[PDB]
């Protein structure tokens, strides 16, 4: 049982569900419901509503306070609310220290509810989709939310399935419905669902659908997506069911008209909604930093208030009680005076980390999340989507991203095939002209004005190809294009004359439509014939066999008889398997392969075409063998294979084709910039292993000179690292260093293609059969000697070490692609990278299988604009194109980290230079805890005088423009190594605040120990000593915010000179008496210069010795050229030809030979 690597291992991840047809009150019996503590009780059967919000009606208050108090500062403020209410040391009148705290909690709660109403509105656009339900009589319209288990609903074409329905009738012959699952598992091919044999022939009608006494005994909701073991108890010897008769939620009905079905599961019981789960509360990487700061400030505050309360004890018993003037009626001992003033110094020294922190952070983070959805250059004009920002709390983490995990189908690609070029007898066709007439003239697209069914859909440029099929001078060309219209499974569906193609493959409808644009149109097929009108003349071949496509056959073929009476075999398929079935007389066996090299050199997906004359006698001996094994019990799928290649030898080539897969407008050049900013990209997809390699070549993740290292290679390279070189493996080395170099020789660019089946083998995560252990854990099957086996597992030894080795190996692969992975294997991969080698991760994708990965990554993005919006509602940001990831990361991301690291640095300097003056003043008043400012200035400092200029900076500052911030993606690296602000740069903004609070006091103290005036108006009192310090503090801390801003708007300079003017203006007693004198206006000027002049001489000295890479860009902002690079990396050939890798890719299923069975036509 080797890894199948084609199966999407949904594993290793009949219980009486009892739907019972209608019976809308059978499910309301009390023997099914669950009862809870209060009178409100739920049921076992869930409703069909979707809830993505967090606060419903009345859990908003208890829950939001819980995540409000997850910040260390909200405990800091509350503790002082209690400490300022004890009356012995209260220092306060009536409670004015609680309303400010409530208003702070009343701003973050209302910003977190405006955000959670838009999410409460997005769910309204799903639960109102109006799919028909049968109430009592006929069919009536009804919304998705009012659908319950056990309903008979009707669907139309191109409609979405609302719940897990059991198909029981349809409008197609034999009642089978076609459905695509591009939102469930990333596949682009259609998958037919065939109803039951008894329900099709009896219900089939609305009138008798209202009477259906059905019964189901299926299994339980188990996020399996491919099993569904259960039976249908209609009546009288019931019928069984299977996954072939189940339609899931995130599907889309296609190529039918209307179908009917029961409802087995609903809402959060469906098999897609059990794969997306465990939502969590996301907090950025700076939020864990703003916690360690408050934990350090609070420890410093306890020490200072305890070292200044000892001084008030020794002073109150040395100078304090001898002093008669300081007489108080109390009799407190000097050792109790010290205790009572320790709490007085926590009230005074508390206005560091002040209350206006989480108000001015959630105003900076609210105005930065509005620059994302006002962006006129992240707006997708075609579908009219504005690139909303949905979380408004994770902004600064966009500029710290390490890894990016993306989905392929629907995100990197736009699901278009567009037949590109072909090779017929060596020479390729469709370069630009490749002709004689109209060669050096313009390169206009050729006119299909000669075909009647042309419909002008295909885009072609080659004149020579289209004229050579009009002449008929080269016989071996019309034979090529006739084969494209014979070897397929398409269905034709004509309303009136105009013909459409109901192909159940994206890669097959591209070729058939390619043929029709060069004649050879496919008209119809009954059950045995195919009618084709090539170049006007219409002919009717008959079909003798169809050796259909398979996962491990890689080819499809047909045997036809021409109307003349000549039987032959047509065939198409891969290039590596036709080359072991072709005759050894072809002259073109090499020249076509040369085209295959060129087709595979570009990013195209190629097939080989061939045929063989079937003589006239070996057919009959084989036709007998074909019919013999066609019907069989068990050797009917694999022994018919032994007959399929009984006739494959002696094939002759015609050429090759080449289909493209349009990526998106600007995906490959987005990846180049992102990889240049040192971001690793992994592609986790659900599509086949060959299509994930084609896209990995188109978007330049893995170009030429890149060893691929498939999945079966990795499991061997990791067994030569663990099974050896630890303590065993032949000759012991006594060292066993797992650091030798890298797992790899130097040379880099070693991609890694891994399938989901191999990813469950490499990480030792599987499910084992039952027969591995004897019984349960109890003292009989295991002795009491410390539970030697059922408790000693030893799995956590290998498992944790095996996961650590894998992630260490993928650190140097330069490209990782994982394919055929379960929707919760994608989340597991995201979680191994953010556990070992901790990293900030992003996850972008669309569709219901990316919801689990979006919830697990640090930041989740969802592609919006299409009809499937499942992955948008669980995201954090949602634009519409992959190419907008440049601006979300390199403009809105690295600006938002610069602006938040400058607000924090300046917020802990303006508040340490203010609150720490009371520390130096304590040595000159007997450690009495008395304030060195007035009382109106303490309560107006961080509200009016210094609160605006940093807010207008945190919203408007920008390092370099948004035009050359994209051009130099290397500037992103500053915010990703934690260089601009960390725990070692937070201790420099305190040492810069203890030196400012020292100059601002000891310079005015030097000028006051002597006289400053004489006339008797002389201010030397305490009133004027608290105005000299206050007015030398507003001027200083409002100049250090002028040296910081490097982008001076007008409102950014009216807010600095409008805070100093608001101080000297509102203050004009002691105000009009100390500021009127020459000596006061010289202590202020000296104090400002001394504490502002050396912080310029460190910015200039640290800019011309170790300039940052953001400083060199500004110096040459006006001495640089332009650029228009990234064309395609033209790599025409190589001398070291070694790749010779097959570009084979084909999206199709097995078993589409419904045709030969009963001709599913009419």
């Amino acid at each position: 049982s080797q890894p199948n690597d084609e199966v999407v291992p949904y594993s290793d991840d009949e219980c009486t569900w009892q739907v019972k047809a209608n019976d809308r009150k059978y499910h309301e019996q009390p023997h099914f419901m669950n009862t809870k503590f209060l009178c409100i009780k739920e049921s076992k059967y869930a409703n069909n509503a979707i809830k993505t919000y967090k606060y419903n009606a009345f859990t908003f208050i208890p829950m939001n306070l819980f995540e409000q108090f997850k910040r260390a500062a909200n405990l800091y403020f509350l503790a002082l609310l209690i400490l300022q209410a004890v009356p012995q040391i209260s220092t306060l009148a009536w409670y004015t220290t609680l309303v400010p705290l409530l208003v702070v909690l009343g701003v973050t709660a209302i910003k977190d509810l405006v955000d959670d109403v838009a999410r409460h509105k997005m769910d309204k656009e799903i639960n109102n989709r109006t799919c028909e339900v049968i109430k009592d009589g006929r069919f009536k319209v009804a919304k998705w939310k009012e659908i319950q288990v056990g309903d008979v609903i009707r669907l139309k074409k191109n409609d979405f399935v609302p719940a897990d329905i059991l198909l029981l009738s349809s409008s197609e012959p034999n009642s089978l419905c076609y459905v695509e699952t591009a939102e469930l598992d990333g596949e682009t091919n259609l998958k037919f669902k065939m109803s039951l044999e008894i329900t099709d022939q009896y219900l089939q009608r609305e009138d008798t659908l209202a009477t259906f006494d059905g019964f189901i005994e299926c299994e339980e909701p188990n996020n399996r997506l491919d099993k569904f073991t259960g039976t249908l108890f209609w009546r009288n010897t019931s019928f069984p069911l299977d996954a072939d008769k189940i339609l899931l939620r995130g599907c889309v009905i296609r190529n039918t008209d209307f179908c009917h079905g029961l409802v087995i599961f609903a809402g959060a019981d469906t098999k897609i909604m059990k794969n997306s789960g465990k939502t969590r509360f996301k907090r950025t990487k700076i939020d864990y930093l703003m916690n360690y700061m408050v934990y350090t400030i609070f420890v410093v505050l306890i020490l200072l208030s305890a070292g200044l309360a000892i001084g008030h004890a020794y002073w109150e018993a040395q100078v304090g009680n001898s002093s008669w003037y300081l007489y108080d009626g109390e009799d407190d001992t000097p050792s109790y005076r010290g205790f009572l003033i320790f709490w007085g110094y926590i009230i005074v020294l508390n206005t560091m980390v002040p209350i206006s922190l989480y108000v001015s952070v959630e105003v900076i983070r609210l105005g930065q999340s509005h620059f994302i959805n006002w962006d006129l250059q992240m707006y997708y004009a075609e579908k009219d989507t504005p690139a909303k920002a949905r979380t408004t709390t994770l902004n600064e983490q966009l500029g710290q991203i390490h890894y990016i995990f993306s989905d392929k189908t629907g995100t990197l690609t736009q699901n278009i095939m567009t037949f590109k070029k072909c090779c017929i007898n060596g020479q390729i066709y469709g370069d630009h002209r490749d002709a004689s007439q109209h060669n050096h003239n313009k390169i206009e697209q050729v006119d299909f004005s000669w075909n009647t069914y042309a419909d002008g859909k295909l885009a072609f440029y080659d004149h020579y190809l289209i004229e050579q099929i009009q002449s008929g001078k080269e016989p071996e060309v019309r034979q090529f294009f006739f084969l494209l219209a014979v070897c397929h499974t398409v269905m034709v569906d004509r309303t009136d004359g105009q013909l459409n193609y109901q192909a159940a493959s994206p890669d097959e409808g591209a070729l058939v439509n390619a043929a029709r644009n060069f004649g050879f149109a496919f008209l119809a097929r009954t059950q045995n014939t195919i009618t084709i009108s090539e170049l006007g003349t219409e002919r009717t071949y008959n079909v003798l066999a169809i050796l259909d496509f398979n996962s491990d056959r890689k080819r499809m073929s047909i045997i036809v008889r021409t109307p003349e009476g000549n039987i032959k075999l047509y065939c198409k398929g891969a290039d590596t398997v036709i080359y072991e079935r072709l005759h050894r007389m072809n002259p073109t066996k090499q020249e076509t392969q040369d085209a295959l090299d060129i087709f595979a050199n570009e990013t195209l997906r190629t097939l080989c075409l061939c045929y063989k004359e079937i003589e006239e006698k070996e057919f009959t001996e084989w036709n007998k063998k074909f019919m013999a094994a066609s019907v069989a019990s068990t050797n009917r799928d694999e022994a018919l294979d032994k007959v399929y290649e009984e006739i494959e030898k002696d094939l002759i080539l015609l050429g090759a084709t080449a289909i493209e897969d349009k990526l998106q407008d600007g995906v490959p050049e987005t990846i180049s910039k992102l990889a240049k900013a040192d971001i690793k990209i992994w592609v986790l997809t659900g599509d086949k292993k060959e299509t994930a390699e084609n896209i990995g070549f188109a978007c330049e993740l893995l170009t030429e000179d890149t060893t691929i290292c498939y999945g079966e290679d990795i499991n061997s390279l990791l067994h030569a690292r663990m099974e050896n070189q630890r303590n065993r493996g032949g000759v012991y080395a006594k060292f066993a260093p797992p650091v030798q170099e890298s797992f790899f020789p130097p040379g880099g660019n070693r991609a890694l293609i891994i399938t989901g089946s191999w990813l469950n083998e490499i990480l030792l995560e599987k499910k084992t059969k039952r027969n591995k252990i004897l019984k349960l854990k109890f003292p009989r099957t295991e002795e009491e000697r410390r539970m030697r086996t059922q408790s000693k597992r030893r799995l956590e030894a290998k498992k944790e070490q095996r996961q650590k080795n894998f992630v260490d190996l993928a650190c140097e692969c330069s490209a990782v692609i994982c394919c055929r992975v379960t929707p919760k294997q994608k989340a597991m991969v995201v979680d191994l990278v953010k556990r070992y080698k901790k990293a900030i991760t992003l996850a972008i994708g669309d569709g219901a299988n990316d919801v689990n990965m979006i919830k697990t990554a640090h930041i989740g993005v969802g592609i919006s604009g299409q009809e499937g919006m499942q992955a948008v509602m669980s995201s954090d940001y949602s634009f519409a194109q992959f190419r907008y990831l440049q601006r979300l990361l390199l403009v809105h991301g690295r600006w938002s980290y610069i602006r938040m690291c400058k607000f924090l640095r300046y917020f802990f300097y303006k508040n340490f230079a203010f609150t720490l003056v009371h520390f130096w003043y304590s040595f000159f008043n007997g450690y009495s805890a008395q304030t060195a400012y007035e009382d109106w200035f303490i309560t107006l400092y961080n509200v009016l005088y210094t609160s605006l200029p940093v807010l207008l900076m945190g919203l408007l500052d920008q390092d370099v423009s948004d035009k050359l911030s994209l051009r130099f993606p290397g500037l992103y690296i500053v915010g990703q190594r934690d260089l601009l602000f960390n725990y070692k740069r937070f201790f420099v903004s305190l040492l810069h605040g203890v030196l400012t609070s020292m100059i601002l006091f000891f310079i005015p103290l030097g000028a006051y120990l002597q006289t400053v005036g004489q006339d008797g108006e002389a201010p030397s009192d305490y009133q004027s000593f608290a105005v000299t310090i206050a007015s030398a503090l507003v001027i200083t801390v409002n100049f250090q915010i002028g040296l910081d801003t490097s982008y001076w708007t007008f409102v950014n300079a009216f807010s600095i000179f409008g805070s100093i003017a608001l101080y000297f203006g509102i203050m004009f007693g002691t105000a009009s008496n100390a500021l009127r004198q020459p000596y006061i206006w010289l202590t202020i000027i000296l104090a400002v210069a001394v504490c502002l002049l050396p912080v310029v001489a460190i910015r200039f000295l640290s800019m011309t010795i170790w300039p940052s890479e953001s400083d060199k860009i500004q110096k040459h902002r006006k001495r640089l050229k332009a650029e228009e690079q990234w064309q395609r990396r033209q790599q025409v050939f190589r001398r070291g030809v070694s790749t010779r890798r097959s570009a084979y890719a084909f999206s199709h299923q097995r078993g589409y030979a419904d045709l030969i069975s009963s001709g599913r036509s009419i």
Binding site: V319, F924, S928, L1082, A1097
Partner: protein, 331 residues
């Protein structure tokens, strides 16, 4: 879905703005312009401050050698200790006479808040009912104190008299003025007598006298304008100090129209009615005579600070020019 956003320059993050960069010729010539203004200003202060003439007496008699030692623990009628000081150089212009103290913590939190600003503002209602903040000195034997609080309790009450002995048997009583030594907004706005008639005995009816005082506030001075809460010696003490070592204005020594040395050269005697007990807590008392200037007082800290700041700043504009030149167009 939410048609295109507007193109206004604020929403697109492209507001008009000035982008400043710290070049060579922007922060190099600011370390020199400051260096040529701070040194001249630092000499103007020092030279001006040097020519104010100042004398201190320090008449606290802690040492046995001082004549005022006979009144550290008195037990008799008020003392009178006399000190002889000499003005070796003359005083001209106007003269100010202060008194100084030391180890007096008038900025203590238990002492600063001990007043009642409503009462001192001539409030007819709270005069009979002082606030609780002055609790040690809020009430007396069923009578409230008119000047309430621990600040007005410990007012300075020493009396200083200056005599010019230019000839014996005639110590000249140098004239001292006691009016005009308070903030102009304290005598006319902040401190107001209660709104009564014209007898201060009736305005203060029923209110007692401060514990440590000797006469009620309605007889502090005989001038009917300068009496009560509007007293100027009282106002100056109420205006608390900022550091333990302070000085407060006492009297003015006016000059005369004829050009004379207001305090002429010669010997003088200071006649002191020692009352204020500062020696208990290591206090010190002083009497200070100073002259005026168009700049300020004898303040030499600013003079030295500007010379030191204006030179260190200058000697940074040089070491930021041998480094900018060396490290530009290079590593």
């Amino acid at each position: 879905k939410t048609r295109r956003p507007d193109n206004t320059a604020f929403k697109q993050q492209r507001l008009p703005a000035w982008q400043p960069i710290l070049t060579a010729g922007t922060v190099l010539p600011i370390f020199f312009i400051i260096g040529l203004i701070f040194i001249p200003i630092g000499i103007g202060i020092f030279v001006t401050s040097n020519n104010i003439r100042e004398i201190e007496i320090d008449y606290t008699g802690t040492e046995p050698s001082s004549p005022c030692n006979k009144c550290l623990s008195p037990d008799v009628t008020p003392c009178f200790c006399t000190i002889n000081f000499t003005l070796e150089k003359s005083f001209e212009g106007n003269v100010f006479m202060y008194y100084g103290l030391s180890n007096f913590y008038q900025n203590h939190r238990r002492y600063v808040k001990s007043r009642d600003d409503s009462q001192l503002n001539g409030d007819s209602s709270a005069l009979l009912n002082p606030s609780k903040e002055c609790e040690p000195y809020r009430r007396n034997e069923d009578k409230p104190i008119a000047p309430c609080g621990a600040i007005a309790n410990s007012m300075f009450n020493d009396t200083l008299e200056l005599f010019l002995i230019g000839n014996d048997s005639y110590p000249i009583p140098i004239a001292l003025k006691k009016k005009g030594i308070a903030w102009w907004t304290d005598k006319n706005v902040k401190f107001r007598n209660p709104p009564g008639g014209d007898n201060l005995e009736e305005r203060f009816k029923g209110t007692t006298k401060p514990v440590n005082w000797l006469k009620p506030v309605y007889m502090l001075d005989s001038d009917p304008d300068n009496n009560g809460f509007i007293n100027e010696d009282f106002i100056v003490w109420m205006r608390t100090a900022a550091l333990p070592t302070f000085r407060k204005l006492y009297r003015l020594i006016e000059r005369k129209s004829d050009l004379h040395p207001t305090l002429p050269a010669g010997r003088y005697s200071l006649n002191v009615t020692y009352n204020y007990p500062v020696h208990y807590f290591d206090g010190r008392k002083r009497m200070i005579l100073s002259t005026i200037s168009w700049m300020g007082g004898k303040n030499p800290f600013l003079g030295i600070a500007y010379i030191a700041v204006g030179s260190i700043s200058f000697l940074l504009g040089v070491v930021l020019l041998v480094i900018n030149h060396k490290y530009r167009n290079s590593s």
